[PDB]
C-alpha cells in the first residue's frame, strides 16, 4: 500500500453533520445519509420559489379578510387603489390590515370612493368632468 | 376525454393575440423607402463592421511575457529578520 486516504473520517463527517437531526438509520449510516441529505439540499434550493409564492398568497388572503371586513372584495381594493396611483404593495397592505386598522379603513374607503367614481363616470354620456379622485398625476 | 371544451378565457386570450397581430399587419403596409431607394445606403457601415470582425479575428497571438512576473515568484520565501 503506497497511498491510502488517511482522512476519510472528515469527508464522512462533512455529510453526517447535516444529518444528525434526521430520523432512522439514515442519520448515522453514510450510504443513506448522503441520499437524504442531497434530497434535503435540493428541496432547500427549490423551496425559495415556493417561499415567495406562499407569502404572497398569505398576504392576499389576509388582505381579502380585512377588505371583506369593510364590505369590499379584494378585486376592488387592488384594482381600484392603483387607479388612485397608490403603489402600496401587498406585504405592507397586510401589515396595515393587522397592525393599523384605521389606516386600512381609510384605504378601503378610498378604494370604494374610486370604484363609485368609475361606475358613475361609465354610466354617464361622454366625458363629463372626471371624479375628484380619478384625476391622474403625470410624471 | 380526448376532446376538450374550449373555455371563454382561452377565446379571450386568442382574440388578444389576434388583435396584436392585426395591428402588426397595419404597421407593415407602409414602408419609408422602396426596394430600389434603399439599395446601398448601409454599405459603408456593413463593410466597416465586417472589417472590425476581420481585424479582431486576425489579431490572436500569445500574450507577452515579462521578467518581472517570473522573478516575483521568489517572493514565496520572503522573511522578516
Amino acid at each position: 500500500l503506497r497511498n491510502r486516504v488517511t482522512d476519510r473520517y472528515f469527508r464522512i463527517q462533512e455529510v453526517l453533520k447535516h444529518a444528525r437531526h434526521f430520523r432512522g438509520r439514515k442519520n448515522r449510516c453514510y450510504r443513506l445519509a448522503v441520499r437524504t441529505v442531497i434530497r434535503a439540499f435540493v428541496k432547500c434550493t427549490k423551496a425559495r420559489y415556493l417561499k415567495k409564492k406562499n407569502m404572497r398568497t398569505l398576504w392576499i388572503n389576509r388582505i381579502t379578510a380585512a377588505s371583506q371586513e369593510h364590505g369590499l372584495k379584494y378585486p376592488a381594493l387592488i384594482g381600484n387603489l392603483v387607479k388612485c396611483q397608490v403603489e402600496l404593495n401587498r406585504k405592507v397592505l397586510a401589515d396595515l390590515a393587522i397592525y393599523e386598522p384605521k389606516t386600512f379603513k381609510s384605504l378601503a374607503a378610498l378604494a370604494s370612493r374610486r370604484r363609485h367614481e368609475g361606475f358613475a363616470a361609465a354610466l354617464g354620456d361622454g366625458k363629463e368632468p372626471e371624479g375628484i379622485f380619478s384625476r391622474v398625476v403625470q410624471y | 376525454r380526448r376532446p376538450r371544451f374550449v373555455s371563454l378565457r382561452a377565446k379571450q386570450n386568442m382574440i388578444r393575440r389576434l388583435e396584436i397581430e392585426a395591428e402588426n399587419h397595419y404597421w407593415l403596409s407602409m414602408p419609408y423607402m422602396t426596394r430600389e431607394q434603399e439599395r446601398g445606403h448601409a454599405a459603408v457601415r456593413r463593410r466597416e463592421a465586417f472589417e472590425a470582425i476581420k481585424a479582431a479575428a486576425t489579431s490572436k497571438f500569445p500574450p507577452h511575457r515579462f521578467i518581472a512576473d517570473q522573478l516575483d515568484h521568489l517572493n514565496v520565501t520572503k522573511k522578516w529578520s
Partner: protein
Amino acid sequence: GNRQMTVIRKVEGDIWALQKDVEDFLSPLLGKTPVTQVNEVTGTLRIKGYFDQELKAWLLEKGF
C-alpha cells in the same frame, strides 16, 4: 500548417524598443500594424507572417 511567424531571437537589452522599431518598419509593408509577441525572458520578438528576408536586411542596415 497555416500560422506563419518569424522570430528575432538573441535580442539583448530593451526588447520593447526593438518592438517599436520593427512595428514602424513593417507597418507600411502589410498595410496595418503587425501583431507581435515579446518574450522579455528568453529575449525574443515573435512576429506574425513571413518576413525573414526583410528583417535580415533591416538588421543588416542598422549594423548588427
